[PDB]
Amino acid sequence: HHWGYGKHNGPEHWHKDFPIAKGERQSPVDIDTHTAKYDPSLKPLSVSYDQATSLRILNNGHAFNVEFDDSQDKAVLKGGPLDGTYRLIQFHFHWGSLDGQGSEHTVDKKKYAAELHLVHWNTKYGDFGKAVQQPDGLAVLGIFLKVGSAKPGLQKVVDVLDSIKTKGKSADFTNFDPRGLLPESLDYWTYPGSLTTPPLLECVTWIVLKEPISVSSEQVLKFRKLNFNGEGEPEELMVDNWRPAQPLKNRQIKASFK
Numbered sequence: 001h002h003w004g005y006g007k008h009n010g011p012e013h014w015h016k017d018f019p020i021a022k023g024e025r026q027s028p029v030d031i032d033t034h035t036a037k038y039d040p041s042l043k044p045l046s047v048s049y050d051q052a053t054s055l056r057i058l059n060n061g062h063a064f065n066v067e068f069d070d071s072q073d074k075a076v077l078k079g080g081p082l083d084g085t086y087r088l089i090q091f092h093f094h095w096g097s098l099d100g101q102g103s104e105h106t107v108d109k110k111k112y113a114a115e116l117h118l119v120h121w122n123t124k125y126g127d128f129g130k131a132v133q134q135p136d137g138l139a140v141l142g143i144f145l146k147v148g149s150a151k152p153g154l155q156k157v158v159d160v161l162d163s164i165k166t167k168g169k170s171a172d173f174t175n176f177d178p179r180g181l182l183p184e185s186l187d188y189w190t191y192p193g194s195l196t197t198p199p200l201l202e203c204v205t206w207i208v209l210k211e212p213i214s215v216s217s218e219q220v221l222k223f224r225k226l227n228f229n230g231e232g233e234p235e236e237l238m239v240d241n242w243r244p245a246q247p248l249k250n251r252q253i254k255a256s257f258k
Protein backbone atom coordinates (compact mmCIF):
# COMPACT_ATOMS: atom_id res chain seq x y z
CA HIS A 1 0.00 0.00 0.00
CA HIS A 2 2.53 2.55 -1.37
CA TRP A 3 1.88 6.28 -1.91
CA GLY A 4 0.30 7.47 -5.14
CA TYR A 5 -2.46 9.71 -6.47
CA GLY A 6 -5.58 7.49 -5.74
CA LYS A 7 -8.41 7.90 -3.13
CA HIS A 8 -6.74 5.59 -0.62
CA ASN A 9 -3.09 6.59 -1.23
CA GLY A 10 -3.14 10.19 -2.56
CA PRO A 11 -1.78 13.47 -1.22
CA GLU A 12 -4.12 13.64 1.80
CA HIS A 13 -2.67 10.28 3.01
CA TRP A 14 1.07 11.01 2.52
CA HIS A 15 1.58 12.48 6.00
CA LYS A 16 1.14 9.06 7.65
CA ASP A 17 4.33 7.67 6.02
CA PHE A 18 5.96 11.13 5.55
CA PRO A 19 5.09 13.44 8.47
CA ILE A 20 7.09 16.32 6.89
CA ALA A 21 4.02 16.54 4.55
CA LYS A 22 2.65 18.95 7.24
CA GLY A 23 6.00 20.85 7.51
CA GLU A 24 6.94 24.49 7.41
CA ARG A 25 8.21 24.70 3.80
CA GLN A 26 6.09 22.33 1.68
CA SER A 27 5.49 22.59 -2.06
CA PRO A 28 3.73 23.38 -4.28
CA VAL A 29 2.03 26.69 -3.30
CA ASP A 30 -0.32 29.17 -4.83
CA ILE A 31 1.60 32.17 -6.18
CA ASP A 32 -0.42 35.26 -5.28
CA THR A 33 1.00 37.61 -7.92
CA HIS A 34 -0.11 40.79 -6.06
CA THR A 35 1.58 39.66 -2.72
CA ALA A 36 4.89 38.50 -4.42
CA LYS A 37 7.47 41.21 -3.90
CA TYR A 38 9.77 42.38 -6.66
CA ASP A 39 13.32 41.85 -5.40
CA PRO A 40 15.62 44.11 -7.52
CA SER A 41 18.66 42.33 -5.96
CA LEU A 42 17.67 38.96 -7.69
CA LYS A 43 19.97 38.13 -10.67
CA PRO A 44 18.90 36.93 -14.10
CA LEU A 45 18.70 33.22 -14.20
CA SER A 46 21.65 31.54 -16.05
CA VAL A 47 20.47 28.38 -17.86
CA SER A 48 23.46 26.69 -19.57
CA TYR A 49 22.10 23.60 -21.38
CA ASP A 50 24.35 23.66 -24.58
CA GLN A 51 26.36 20.55 -23.41
CA ALA A 52 23.44 18.67 -21.83
CA THR A 53 23.70 14.85 -22.30
CA SER A 54 20.35 13.08 -22.00
CA LEU A 55 20.65 9.32 -21.48
CA ARG A 56 17.33 7.59 -20.82
CA ILE A 57 13.60 8.00 -20.21
CA LEU A 58 11.96 6.02 -17.37
CA ASN A 59 8.35 5.43 -16.30
CA ASN A 60 8.75 5.29 -12.52
CA GLY A 61 5.06 4.70 -11.73
CA HIS A 62 4.38 8.34 -10.75
CA ALA A 63 5.69 10.24 -13.84
CA PHE A 64 8.33 9.78 -16.50
CA ASN A 65 11.86 11.08 -15.98
CA VAL A 66 14.21 12.15 -18.78
CA GLU A 67 17.60 11.53 -17.11
CA PHE A 68 20.88 13.29 -17.82
CA ASP A 69 24.55 12.52 -17.31
CA ASP A 70 25.27 14.63 -14.21
CA SER A 71 28.85 13.25 -13.71
CA GLN A 72 30.28 16.61 -15.00
CA ASP A 73 29.24 20.34 -15.19
CA LYS A 74 27.45 19.90 -18.58
CA ALA A 75 23.93 21.36 -18.04
CA VAL A 76 23.83 23.82 -15.13
CA LEU A 77 21.60 26.40 -13.54
CA LYS A 78 23.06 29.36 -11.66
CA GLY A 79 22.31 33.00 -10.88
CA GLY A 80 18.81 34.04 -9.95
CA PRO A 81 18.38 33.39 -6.20
CA LEU A 82 21.08 30.68 -6.22
CA ASP A 83 24.55 30.64 -4.64
CA GLY A 84 26.93 28.39 -6.67
CA THR A 85 26.23 25.85 -9.42
CA TYR A 86 23.37 23.37 -9.73
CA ARG A 87 23.60 20.46 -12.20
CA LEU A 88 20.67 19.11 -14.18
CA ILE A 89 19.87 15.48 -13.26
CA GLN A 90 16.37 14.90 -14.74
CA PHE A 91 13.16 16.52 -15.87
CA HIS A 92 9.59 15.31 -15.57
CA PHE A 93 6.04 16.60 -15.74
CA HIS A 94 2.84 16.63 -13.71
CA TRP A 95 -0.45 16.71 -15.65
CA GLY A 96 -4.19 16.34 -15.41
CA SER A 97 -7.03 14.21 -16.73
CA LEU A 98 -8.48 17.42 -18.30
CA ASP A 99 -6.89 20.63 -19.63
CA GLY A 100 -8.35 22.56 -16.61
CA GLN A 101 -5.97 20.95 -14.07
CA GLY A 102 -2.56 19.32 -13.81
CA SER A 103 -0.11 21.93 -12.55
CA GLU A 104 1.22 21.75 -8.97
CA HIS A 105 1.89 25.44 -8.51
CA THR A 106 -1.02 27.76 -9.23
CA VAL A 107 -0.99 31.45 -10.14
CA ASP A 108 -3.75 33.47 -8.44
CA LYS A 109 -5.47 30.02 -8.03
CA LYS A 110 -5.22 29.32 -11.80
CA LYS A 111 -4.30 25.71 -12.61
CA TYR A 112 -2.40 25.02 -15.84
CA ALA A 113 -2.79 21.79 -17.85
CA ALA A 114 0.66 20.55 -16.81
CA GLU A 115 3.94 21.62 -15.14
CA LEU A 116 7.53 20.77 -16.18
CA HIS A 117 10.14 20.34 -13.44
CA LEU A 118 13.83 20.57 -14.38
CA VAL A 119 15.63 19.18 -11.36
CA HIS A 120 19.14 20.36 -10.43
CA TRP A 121 21.42 19.58 -7.45
CA ASN A 122 23.94 21.84 -5.73
CA THR A 123 27.42 20.71 -6.73
CA LYS A 124 28.86 21.66 -3.29
CA TYR A 125 27.15 18.45 -1.95
CA GLY A 126 28.75 16.09 -4.44
CA ASP A 127 25.69 14.00 -5.48
CA PHE A 128 21.90 14.19 -5.58
CA GLY A 129 21.38 11.88 -2.58
CA LYS A 130 23.49 14.11 -0.29
CA ALA A 131 21.94 17.29 -1.79
CA VAL A 132 18.38 16.31 -0.84
CA GLN A 133 19.45 16.27 2.86
CA GLN A 134 20.32 20.01 2.70
CA PRO A 135 18.04 23.06 2.82
CA ASP A 136 19.76 24.46 -0.32
CA GLY A 137 20.39 21.12 -2.00
CA LEU A 138 18.14 21.38 -5.06
CA ALA A 139 16.95 23.98 -7.52
CA VAL A 140 13.82 23.05 -9.46
CA LEU A 141 12.91 25.15 -12.47
CA GLY A 142 9.15 24.95 -12.91
CA ILE A 143 7.48 25.79 -16.23
CA PHE A 144 3.73 25.84 -16.80
CA LEU A 145 2.13 24.17 -19.86
CA LYS A 146 -1.05 25.51 -21.46
CA VAL A 147 -2.88 23.79 -24.34
CA GLY A 148 -2.78 25.63 -27.71
CA SER A 149 -0.04 25.48 -30.35
CA ALA A 150 2.28 22.44 -30.31
CA LYS A 151 5.74 22.70 -28.73
CA PRO A 152 8.03 21.29 -31.44
CA GLY A 153 10.83 20.62 -28.93
CA LEU A 154 8.48 18.34 -26.90
CA GLN A 155 7.56 15.99 -29.76
CA LYS A 156 10.63 13.71 -29.35
CA VAL A 157 9.50 13.05 -25.75
CA VAL A 158 5.85 12.48 -26.82
CA ASP A 159 6.84 9.99 -29.52
CA VAL A 160 8.86 7.68 -27.15
CA LEU A 161 6.07 7.38 -24.51
CA ASP A 162 4.56 4.33 -26.30
CA SER A 163 7.81 2.47 -25.47
CA ILE A 164 7.54 3.24 -21.69
CA LYS A 165 3.81 2.82 -21.17
CA THR A 166 4.06 1.00 -17.87
CA LYS A 167 5.86 1.34 -14.52
CA GLY A 168 9.52 0.23 -14.62
CA LYS A 169 9.95 0.54 -18.39
CA SER A 170 12.90 2.59 -19.68
CA ALA A 171 14.18 3.47 -23.14
CA ASP A 172 17.43 4.98 -24.43
CA PHE A 173 16.87 8.71 -24.95
CA THR A 174 20.06 10.37 -26.14
CA ASN A 175 20.67 13.79 -27.75
CA PHE A 176 17.48 15.41 -26.39
CA ASP A 177 18.01 19.18 -26.02
CA PRO A 178 16.02 20.61 -23.07
CA ARG A 179 16.51 24.18 -24.44
CA GLY A 180 13.56 23.32 -26.75
CA LEU A 181 11.23 23.23 -23.65
CA LEU A 182 11.95 26.80 -22.42
CA PRO A 183 9.72 29.86 -22.96
CA GLU A 184 11.17 33.12 -24.36
CA SER A 185 11.29 34.96 -21.00
CA LEU A 186 13.20 33.79 -17.89
CA ASP A 187 11.17 36.09 -15.55
CA TYR A 188 10.42 34.05 -12.41
CA TRP A 189 9.05 33.77 -8.92
CA THR A 190 11.15 32.05 -6.24
CA TYR A 191 10.56 30.68 -2.73
CA PRO A 192 12.00 27.99 -0.44
CA GLY A 193 10.10 24.68 -0.55
CA SER A 194 10.14 20.95 -0.88
CA LEU A 195 9.93 17.96 -3.18
CA THR A 196 6.26 17.66 -4.24
CA THR A 197 6.35 13.83 -4.00
CA PRO A 198 7.44 11.59 -1.15
CA PRO A 199 9.84 11.85 0.57
CA LEU A 200 8.71 15.55 0.51
CA LEU A 201 12.17 16.69 1.69
CA GLU A 202 12.52 20.42 2.39
CA CYS A 203 15.58 20.89 0.15
CA VAL A 204 14.34 22.92 -2.85
CA THR A 205 14.83 26.46 -4.02
CA TRP A 206 11.84 26.73 -6.36
CA ILE A 207 12.19 28.94 -9.48
CA VAL A 208 8.83 29.12 -11.29
CA LEU A 209 8.81 30.85 -14.68
CA LYS A 210 6.03 33.36 -15.31
CA GLU A 211 5.68 32.58 -19.03
CA PRO A 212 4.02 29.24 -19.79
CA ILE A 213 4.91 27.14 -22.83
CA SER A 214 2.15 26.07 -25.22
CA VAL A 215 1.70 22.39 -26.08
CA SER A 216 -0.97 20.88 -28.34
CA SER A 217 -3.99 18.91 -27.16
CA GLU A 218 -2.50 15.94 -29.05
CA GLN A 219 0.79 16.21 -27.13
CA VAL A 220 -0.93 16.18 -23.68
CA LEU A 221 -3.31 13.41 -24.81
CA LYS A 222 -0.22 11.22 -25.26
CA PHE A 223 0.90 11.95 -21.70
CA ARG A 224 -2.55 10.70 -20.55
CA LYS A 225 -2.05 7.31 -22.30
CA LEU A 226 0.77 6.42 -19.90
CA ASN A 227 0.02 3.96 -17.08
CA PHE A 228 0.72 4.08 -13.33
CA ASN A 229 0.64 0.23 -13.34
CA GLY A 230 3.27 -2.28 -14.38
CA GLU A 231 2.84 -4.51 -17.47
CA GLY A 232 0.34 -7.33 -16.87
CA GLU A 233 -1.40 -5.32 -14.11
CA PRO A 234 -4.84 -3.69 -14.28
CA GLU A 235 -4.59 -0.52 -16.46
CA GLU A 236 -4.73 2.76 -14.52
CA LEU A 237 -4.07 5.84 -16.62
CA MET A 238 -1.26 8.10 -15.43
CA VAL A 239 -3.30 11.29 -15.02
CA ASP A 240 -3.71 13.78 -12.15
CA ASN A 241 -0.22 13.07 -10.78
CA TRP A 242 -0.10 16.52 -9.09
CA ARG A 243 -0.03 17.53 -5.43
CA PRO A 244 -2.36 20.45 -4.63
CA ALA A 245 -1.13 23.77 -3.20
CA GLN A 246 0.14 23.63 0.41
CA PRO A 247 0.08 26.35 3.06
CA LEU A 248 2.59 29.15 2.51
CA LYS A 249 3.23 29.52 6.32
CA ASN A 250 6.16 31.80 7.13
CA ARG A 251 7.38 32.30 3.54
CA GLN A 252 7.65 35.13 1.07
CA ILE A 253 7.53 34.62 -2.70
CA LYS A 254 9.90 36.95 -4.53
CA ALA A 255 9.52 38.14 -8.13
CA SER A 256 12.45 38.78 -10.49
CA PHE A 257 10.34 41.29 -12.44
CA LYS A 258 8.17 44.42 -11.94
Ligand SMILES: Cc1cn([C@H]2C[C@H](n3cc(CNC(=O)Nc4cccc(S(N)(=O)=O)c4)nn3)[C@@H](CO)O2)c(=O)[nH]c1=O
Nearest residue numbers: 117118119128129130132140194195196197198199200204
Ligand atom coordinates in the same frame (compact mmCIF):
# COMPACT_ATOMS: atom_id res chain seq x y z
C1 LIG B 1 20.28 7.77 -0.46
C2 LIG B 1 20.12 8.14 -1.92
C3 LIG B 1 18.94 8.50 -2.46
N1 LIG B 1 18.80 8.92 -3.77
C4 LIG B 1 17.51 9.51 -4.20
C5 LIG B 1 16.37 8.51 -4.35
C6 LIG B 1 15.36 8.84 -3.26
N2 LIG B 1 13.95 8.78 -3.68
C7 LIG B 1 13.39 9.16 -4.85
C8 LIG B 1 12.05 8.96 -4.68
C9 LIG B 1 10.90 9.39 -5.55
N3 LIG B 1 10.61 10.78 -5.26
C10 LIG B 1 11.20 11.74 -5.99
O1 LIG B 1 11.98 11.46 -6.91
N4 LIG B 1 10.90 13.03 -5.63
C11 LIG B 1 11.37 14.17 -6.31
C12 LIG B 1 12.70 14.28 -6.70
C13 LIG B 1 13.12 15.41 -7.39
C14 LIG B 1 12.22 16.41 -7.70
C15 LIG B 1 10.89 16.30 -7.30
S1 LIG B 1 9.76 17.62 -7.69
N5 LIG B 1 8.36 17.02 -8.19
O2 LIG B 1 9.58 18.32 -6.45
O3 LIG B 1 10.38 18.31 -8.79
C16 LIG B 1 10.45 15.18 -6.61
N6 LIG B 1 11.85 8.44 -3.44
N7 LIG B 1 13.00 8.34 -2.82
C17 LIG B 1 15.71 10.28 -2.86
C18 LIG B 1 15.52 10.63 -1.40
O4 LIG B 1 15.41 9.49 -0.54
O5 LIG B 1 17.10 10.43 -3.19
C19 LIG B 1 19.88 8.93 -4.64
O6 LIG B 1 19.79 9.29 -5.81
N8 LIG B 1 21.07 8.54 -4.08
C20 LIG B 1 21.30 8.16 -2.77
O7 LIG B 1 22.43 7.92 -2.39
Ligand SMILES: [Zn+2]
Nearest residue numbers: 092094117196
Ligand atom coordinates in the same frame (compact mmCIF):
# COMPACT_ATOMS: atom_id res chain seq x y z
ZN1 LIG C 1 7.85 17.38 -10.02
